[PDB]
Design a protein around this ligand. Structure first.
Ligand SMILES: COc1ccc(CN2CCc3c(c(C(=O)NCc4ccc(SC)cc4)nn3CCN)C2)c2ccccc12
Ligand code: NA
Length: 62
């Protein structure tokens, strides 16, 4: 599915060593700009073992 593709692409991005050391805020605003919802961003962070609360993701984006 395209939601699965968005989340899969996000996961691979969040694993990259250069991206791990980039702040959470920057990565959340960036992934929103790539067309992910807050929920999809949240799922990607959890899948890579860097879980965030959905609240944190929505607070960054708002
Ligand atoms: C905020 O910090 C940053 C932003 C952007 C970059 C630049 N990256 C260049 C290489 C690159 C990038 C992506 C990428 O954006 N992947 C996510 C994605 C999500 C959704 C869909 S839509 C299905 C497509 C893709 N995939 N590649 C190449 C191998 N993965 C982004 C940074 C580079 C270093 C450090 C911090 C960064
Ligand atoms: Na941050």
């Amino acid at each position: 599915s395209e939601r699965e593709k968005r989340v899969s692409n996000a996961v691979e991005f969040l694993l990259d060593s250069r991206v791990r050391r980039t702040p959470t805020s920057s990565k959340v605003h960036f992934l929103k700009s790539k067309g992910l919802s807050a929920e999809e961003i949240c799922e990607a962070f959890t899948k890579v073992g860097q879980p965030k609360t959905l609240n944190e993701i929505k607070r960054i984006l708002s």
